[PDB]
Amino acid sequence: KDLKGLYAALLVPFDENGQVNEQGLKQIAQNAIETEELDGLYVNGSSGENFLLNTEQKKQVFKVAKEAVGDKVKLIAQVGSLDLNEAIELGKYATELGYDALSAVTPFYYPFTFEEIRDYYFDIIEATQNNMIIYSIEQFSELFNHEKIVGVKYTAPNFFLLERIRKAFPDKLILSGFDEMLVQATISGVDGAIGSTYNVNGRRARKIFDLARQGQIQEAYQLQHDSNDIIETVLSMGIYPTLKEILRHRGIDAGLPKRPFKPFNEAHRQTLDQLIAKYDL
Amino acid sequence: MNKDLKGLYAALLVPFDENGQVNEQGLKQIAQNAIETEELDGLYVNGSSGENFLLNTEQKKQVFKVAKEAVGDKVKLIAQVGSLDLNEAIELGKYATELGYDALSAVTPFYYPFTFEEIRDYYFDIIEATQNNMIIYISIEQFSELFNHEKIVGVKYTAPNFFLLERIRKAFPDKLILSGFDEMLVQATISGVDGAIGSTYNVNGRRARKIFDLARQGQIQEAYQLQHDSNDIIETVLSMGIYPTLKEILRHRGIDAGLPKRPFKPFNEAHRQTLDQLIAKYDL
Amino acid sequence: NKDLKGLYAALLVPFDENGQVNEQGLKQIAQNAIETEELDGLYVNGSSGENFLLNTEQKKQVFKVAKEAVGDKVKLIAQVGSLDLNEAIELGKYATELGYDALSAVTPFYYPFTFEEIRDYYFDIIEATQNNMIIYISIEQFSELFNHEKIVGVKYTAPNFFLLERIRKAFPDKLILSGFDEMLVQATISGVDGAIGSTYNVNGRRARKIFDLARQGQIQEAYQLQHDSNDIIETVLSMGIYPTLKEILRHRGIDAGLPKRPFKPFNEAHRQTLDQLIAKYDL
Amino acid sequence: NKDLKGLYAALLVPFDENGQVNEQGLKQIAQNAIETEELDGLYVNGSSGENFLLNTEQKKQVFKVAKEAVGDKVKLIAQVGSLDLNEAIELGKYATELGYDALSAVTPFYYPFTFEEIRDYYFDIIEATQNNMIIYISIEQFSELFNHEKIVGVKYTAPNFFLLERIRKAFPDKLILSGFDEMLVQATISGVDGAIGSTYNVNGRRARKIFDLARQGQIQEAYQLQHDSNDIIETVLSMGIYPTLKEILRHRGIDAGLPKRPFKPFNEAHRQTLDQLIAKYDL
Ligand SMILES: [Cl-]
Ligand SMILES: [Cl-]
Ligand SMILES: [Cl-]
Ligand SMILES: [Cl-]
């Protein structure tokens, strides 16, 4: 699979004890593809509350998400972990399930050197033999020299650096991670995008992407205005519980956020009701 | 009428002699280069790019006078008069206004942690004393309060944040927005800016105008290709010392581009070959 | 109940080439801290132990080995913080059952958690474990955390001596343990109750003198020992702090193993400079 | 040639409604610093003096008045830094001609100047004035700056006590004056030669006691005085430091005038809390 296109960053529903609700998760995954008409799912990224999960729950998410959608759906498995043994084990498990590529967040918390960051990606690639999507221009170059590093999920909203990476690496995949600047990413030549709000707003996101590349820039930007009202509202109410409340409105068992995230605050119910009416969410 | 000042502006560079005095003939050549050669809509005079904050009050007036004399009546003129000395800001604002500059602008008061009310009344005091239109440099609720002033016509927007820019464009459809980041002109353009102010348009304003025009005509691919070209230029000049290097490019065209004012140091000759290579490649 | 004041080694962990805990060396490292470095306690599974690189089973393994290594009088604090609250609760219960004197938990990180989220993360761990807790934010918020009788103190790592003085003043009944070895003398005169540090694994004798001399008002001599300690700290930082501390320990005949990847091993290009440091300061 | 050790008031300036210096109030403020606060010297035309808001003639005016207000024993440091280097040299010569013991200059700001540009700005002022200079940057770059015979020290304002300790150790013979009032006690035990502060205009007596007691090793008493000083500092920062400090002086019968716009005057809604602090601390 060419990995171009638009991906929902897959949300995960939990019960009160922080266990995955598998029925709700299957429904969320199918919502992304069938209702929001997206190209694929980005599984166990930050938007999935991945970093709050134990290893067996991560595996549980990968399997459920894979068995919920058809064979033509593009699937990217985020497997980064500060525990490299865990990253490799998740990488092998996702590869065996048939995920089209892995990705891995930059090793964090500790001040890792670039050399340490580089060999963390190279070690995961070596053990899994799958394609890898990563998260400075001389450094990018050394990462992207690797033929199995097919791309970057670019989340730093610096359009100068984006433009430099675009031109420097015309043949690698660039997927942007900032929903609220989709139209700017699009005219900057990204090959697609990954976003949490595409779970509820993937149809507008598609129009933004398509229309911007078709020269219809005013129309794409108007839809960005509309999408940015939604994104701003959802951010102000607590992004992941509120996205899942919007889904729950659709009859989906969207459950609860995993503690220490708190549930949607009902003080926001009226404003959320107004948003959902305004934009037909 | 808030949109009268739309368009593309050179942030006017200033040549100095060895004692940090304005070279007036070189300044006239720079102003004329921006309008006649680079084909820009106007000059932004005494901003950061003119080393404004290194100047005494007399030198600022001198630059305002010469820039204005150098251009025809149809060329748009914006006078940056911000200063931590509010008395000086008012003096320069009155002076620039009597000269016939079409608006004033003023950088956000800096150095000290000023409160928003102090920043607000800094602008309100300049406006009250000069009665000219004002362009500002802060949340959306804070923008709303500043833009409720009939004489605050718009903003020169330099924050690298396209979420806030979009929010501002949506919230203030009839205010002037001019972007100040040359390396993101194409993104600013599709985000609905009414124009741009740039130091690199002194040497690259023809590409800048094509980027602006092609992007608004939806020729997005061709606009973006010109942004790649411009960004090679911008990245190169930033790496050599922006103001001195821009002036060296101007010197190549036969302009009396002089020196930067200390404590900026002159163009370092170790960069000479890399610069000549850039000038040849992009025909600068 | 033990008094928790005093000086603690942040316990380092030796690994084999597969990132598995070396139980033999871990025991030697724990015993070095108490018996050679003369420290009051161990701070187990903190950042310095490469805790955030471990799986749950390995964290329990380290808790168990450290406890087994030390006498009944040794103070033991178990860092159980995790982005996975279920894991943090489970490690908290396990360490309490081992008999650890207090738990601590890093601030939930990575995500932009609200304060109420952070507060209730601490309160949740407490309800489940019933152990005393040490936290890692304005004075107004500290008040809300310290209001809890089971939040007994703070391991204070932010390099800001104005916030430190305010917290000391406002909360005279709470334990403050500073985590910046290179500013021990400044923390001591600011009234901290003790300190936790990774370099006390190799420089614990000098740290005790800094602490004691400074409280006794012999400030000039404490500050000279801070100069000497900071030569060591700067050097060790410039070489990769965790691998280098463990190299110094190896020199005393401890099986200090390897760091866990993605941390890289001690670069041998540093060996001569490290040999010199060990000679100069008799480490 | 005066030694420059000790405690300096960062001289506050009173203005009228048009932003002109109230010269009579300025003398009162200079004299209060030396005669009531019992301070060693005055730091003139720094940030606390609203210096960067002034025109050249006003800066000269402030230098002249402050000098004439104090006796021959008083140490005087003239801050002459400006983004206009021609103005800085002019001010440098003027202050030198009036007999200021040293010059100082803030780090060139606003633009992103290279270290080579910052270095040559200092070197240029020194070369035109021939006076001693205090600077405001890594250790290697400090080593290059301090290699100049006429760079005699540094007004150290970065709240970083690891770098302070490194500088103190690497430059045993240079003058280090700290600029953080709220951390005077930590600076003192770190071996600073003295301190410059705006709050010493109203609290120099406590400041001196903190400085002397800490150096005499009565660290518990010095720390308590810092608790009281930080109460004051935390309150006046919360109300707008410059205007509030001057309001405290007005209360002493001093003509404290107004701040220069765009600073706003003291807001009367803080009156109650201020009166209460002045009461508690006898200011
Ligand atoms: Cl994600
Ligand atoms: Cl400018
Ligand atoms: Cl630790
Ligand atoms: Cl000052």
**Contacts of residue D183 in chain C, CB cutoff 8 Å?**
161-162, 165
Radius of gyration of chain A from Cα atoms?
18
Q: How far apart are the CA of D166 and the centre of ligand 1, in A?
A: 43
Nearest CA-CA partner of A84 in A123, A114, A52: A123
Structural domain containing residue D100: 1-283
Q: How many domains does chain C have?
A: 1
Taking a C-beta distance cutoff of 8 angstroms, is the pair B81, B64 a contact?
A: no
- Label residue A262 exposed, middle or buried (CB < 10 Å: 0-12, 13-18, 19+): middle
Chain C, residues 128-187, CB within 8 A of chain D, namely 159-162, 165-166, 169, 180, 182-183, 185-186
Chain D nearest-CA residue for B122? D262
Separation CA A239–CA A47 (nearest Å): 9
| Nearby residues of A187 by Cβ (< 8 Å), 6 or more positions away | A212, A217, B186, B187, B190, B215, B220, B223, B224
Between CA B70 and CA B78, with CA B76 as vertex, the angle to 5 degrees is 90
How much helix, strand and coil, in percent to the nearest 5, is found in chain D? 55, 15, 35
Taking a C-beta distance cutoff of 8 angstroms, is the pair D229, D184 a contact?
A: yes
Q: Which residue's structure tokens are 């918020």? A: C141
Count chain A–chain B contacts defined by CB atoms under 8 A.
74
Question: Among residues B9, B95, B137, B201, which one is catalytic?
Answer: B137
Taking a C-beta distance cutoff of 8 angstroms, is the pair D77, D41 a contact?
A: yes
For residue D155, indicate whether it is catalytic: yes
Separation CA A143–CA A163 (nearest Å): 18
Mutation for testing the D interface, residue in B87, B108, B245 having most D CBs under 10 Å: B87
DSSP conformational letter for C223:
H
| Nearby residues of D222 by Cβ (< 8 Å), 6 or more positions away | C189, D185, D188, D209, D210, D213, D214
Q: Can you say whether residue B264 is alpha, beta or left, with left for phi > 0 and alpha for psi between -120 and 50 degrees? A: beta
Question: Among residues B60, B68, B76, B156, which one is catalytic?
Answer: B156
Beta strand C151-156 pairing with A5-9: unpaired
Separation CA A215–CA D211 (nearest Å): 69
Nearest CA-CA partner of C145 in C113, C117, C165: C117
- Amino acid at residue number D213: L
Separation CA C264–CA A110 (nearest Å): 13
* Touching pair C, D by Cβ (3+ pairs < 8 Å): yes
Experimental approach was X-ray
Residues D53, B85: C-beta atoms closer than 8 Å: yes
| Nearest bound ligand to the CA of residue B14 | 2
Q: Give the ranges where C70-183 is alpha helix by DSSP (H).
A: 85-98, 115-129, 139-146, 161-170
Q: How far apart are the CA of D178 and the centre of ligand 4, in A?
A: 11
D87 inside 8 A of chain B by CB: yes
What is the CATH classification number for the domain harbouring B49?
3.20.20.70
Q: Give the ranges where D112-257 is alpha helix by DSSP (H).
A: 115-129, 139-146, 161-170, 184-189, 200-215, 219-239, 241-250
String of b and e for D22-56 (b: at least 16 CB within 10 Å)?
A: bbebbbbbbbbbbeebebbbbbbbbbbbbbbbbbb
Phi, psi of A195 (to 5 degrees): -155, 145
Separation CA D166–CA D185 (nearest Å): 18
- Label residue C72 exposed, middle or buried (CB < 10 Å: 0-12, 13-18, 19+): exposed
Q: Which helix (H) or strand (E) holds B99?
A: helix B86-99
Structure tokens belonging to residue D33:
């610093």
Residue A14, strand partner residues: A20, A256
Q: Which chains touch A (3 or more CB pairs under 8 A)?
A: B, C
Structure tokens belonging to residue D99:
């007999």
Beta strand D175-178 pairing with A74-78: unpaired
Resolution (A): 2.0
* Touching pair C, B by Cβ (3+ pairs < 8 Å): no
Taking a C-beta distance cutoff of 8 angstroms, is the pair B247, B267 a contact?
A: yes
* C47 known ligand binder: yes
Binding residues of A: 46-47, 177, 179-180, 196, 240
Question: Among residues C8, C43, C122, C136, which one is catalytic?
Answer: C136
Taking a C-beta distance cutoff of 8 angstroms, is the pair D283, D245 a contact?
A: no
Q: How far apart are the CA of D259 and the centre of ligand 3, in A?
A: 48
Secondary structure string (H, E, C) spanning A119-137: HHHHHHHHHHCCCEEECCH
Beta strand D175-178 pairing with A132-134: unpaired
